[PDB]
């Protein structure tokens, strides 16, 4: 049962601050330092803060030494970012990590949360508008038929899409979203199929933004 | 950060490597490199530590070693999901305590593909917006590059389209592109002839998928 969960992320204003957590599970949490590690969007994993088993060492990246402080709680079994003064730059699915090493250090990293987005924007929250990419007759594939849903107009990320409850899964595609010069987020999601199962299958995308809680089914169909 | 090529790429069965250059005082002078595989969305994983050791479980067909003030991880017998990001990472002897290598994408080089390609038309929902997305799906194409313009009555569009490419696929090693068109529905009902044309290495000319506005 060995692992990490993190908590806490979100969209927070610039200026403004922050709590994240990373709640371990499955080992014993006070034997091995625990890390900090951010990813901004399309960047690289960017070492950002680390505290000694004890917590009686807690230690820090330059970039974020100034307005960033890291904790923890072997009873709770449980590490913090308090992030405070938050800036935009701080925009990163932020990560915590183990060293496994015992009574030396890997410099290495094994167990791995699944990630937290902490978005530093001014903007608001908005929820997509999610509208049919219906098969179309102009285009029609001998044996594949292509359709999708178009999910418009959102912030923050991320937003998630799945096809008939998650029944469908091979043959989709859901595109990276990318930021309009609207500040607002928009990506399309498609599926492949035979063209013959228009006619015997019906296809619900099924859209969740979390942060805006907006669940939208939409049904992409024939004319 | 530490020093890595942008891209590497290979065939499956090849033997590629990624080279991580650093300093005296880190990947040159210590044998604490670490690497770290990451797929597109997922946590890292840690492949080689203490610069040639693999942690229980890692594949043997990734190996670390070094030379000088450069690690290198080889990856044996490439597969197509092998396709990801890796990172190295060092102690220093420096203030700096640890820190990661810039990152390198790995790409399975396969056979040509050439787009699959699909043209949808705004929905009736969306035009009582005011607005109107026409949307150009270019499926499962090889290799990478490909270009895509948008033409309403025949006349070339520009700065009102924007693209959006999936990562390598695991299992095919394909691509796919969206590239969605944004009118006023206004300007969108003013024409009538809506196209999409792609230019793509495994396609002989251009492949045009087009609707007409108003037609069934
Ligand atoms: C946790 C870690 C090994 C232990 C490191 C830590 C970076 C900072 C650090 C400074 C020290 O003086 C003791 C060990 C620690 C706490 C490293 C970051 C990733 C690596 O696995």
């Known amino acids: 049962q060995v692992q990490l969960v993190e908590s806490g992320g979100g969209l927070v204003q610039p200026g403004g601050s922050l709590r994240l957590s990373c709640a371990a599970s499955?080992?014993?949490?006070?034997?091995?330092?625990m890390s900090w590690v951010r990813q901004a969007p399309g960047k690289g994993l960017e070492w950002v803060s680390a505290?000694?088993?004890?917590?009686?060492?807690?230690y820090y990246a330059d970039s974020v030494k100034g307005r960033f402080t890291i904790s923890r709680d072997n009873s709770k079994n449980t590490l913090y970012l308090q992030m405070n003064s938050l800036r935009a730059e701080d925009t990163a699915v932020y990560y915590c990590?183990?060293?496994?090493?015992?009574?030396?250090?890997?410099?290495?990293?094994?167990?791995w949360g699944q990630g937290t987005l902490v978005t530093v924007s001014s903007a608001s929250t908005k929820g997509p508008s999610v509208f049919p990419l219906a098969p179309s007759s102009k285009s029609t594939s001998g044996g594949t038929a292509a359709l999708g849903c178009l999910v418009k107009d959102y912030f923050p990320e991320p937003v998630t899409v799945s096809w008939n409850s998650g029944a469908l899964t091979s043959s989709v595609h859901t595109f990276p979203a990318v930021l309009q010069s609207s500040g607002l987020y928009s990506l399309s999601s498609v599926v492949t199929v035979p063209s013959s199962s228009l006619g015997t299958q019906t296809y619900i995308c099924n859209v969740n933004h979390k942060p805006s809680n907006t669940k939208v089914d939409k049904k992409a169909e024939p004319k | 950060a530490l020093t890595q090529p942008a891209s590497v790429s290979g065939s499956p069965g090849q033997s590629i490597t990624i080279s991580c250059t650093g300093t005296?005082?880190?990947?040159?002078?210590?044998?604490?490199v670490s690497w770290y595989q990451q797929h597109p969305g997922k946590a890292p994983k840690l492949m080689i530590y203490?610069?040639?050791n693999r942690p229980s479980g890692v594949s043997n067909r990734f190996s670390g070693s070094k030379s000088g003030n450069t690690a290198s991880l080889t990856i044996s017998g490439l597969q197509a999901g092998d396709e990801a990001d890796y990172y190295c990472?060092?102690?220093?002897?420096?203030?700096?305590?640890?820190?990661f290598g810039t990152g390198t994408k790995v790409e399975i080089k396969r056979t040509v593909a050439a787009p699959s390609v699909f043209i949808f038309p705004p929905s009736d929902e969306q035009l009582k917006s005011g607005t109107a997305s026409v949307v150009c799906l270019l499926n499962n194409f090889y290799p990478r590059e490909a270009k895509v313009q948008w033409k309403v009555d025949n006349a070339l569009q520009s700065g009102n389209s924007q693209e959006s490419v999936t990562e390598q696929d695991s299992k095919d090693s394909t691509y796919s592109l969206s590239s969605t068109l944004t009118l006023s529905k206004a300007d969108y009902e003013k024409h009538k002839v809506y196209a999409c044309e792609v230019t793509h290495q495994g396609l002989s000319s251009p492949v045009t998928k087009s609707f007409n506005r108003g037609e069934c």
């Open positions: 990590a183990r060293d496994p090493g015992l009574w030396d250090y890997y410099y290495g990293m094994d167990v």
């Open positions: 499955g080992f014993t949490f006070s034997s091995y330092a």
């Open positions: 505290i000694s088993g004890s917590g009686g060492s807690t």
């Open positions: 005296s005082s880190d990947v040159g002078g210590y044998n604490y």
């Open positions: 203490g610069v040639t």
């Open positions: 990472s060092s102690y220093t002897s420096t203030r700096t305590p640890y820190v």
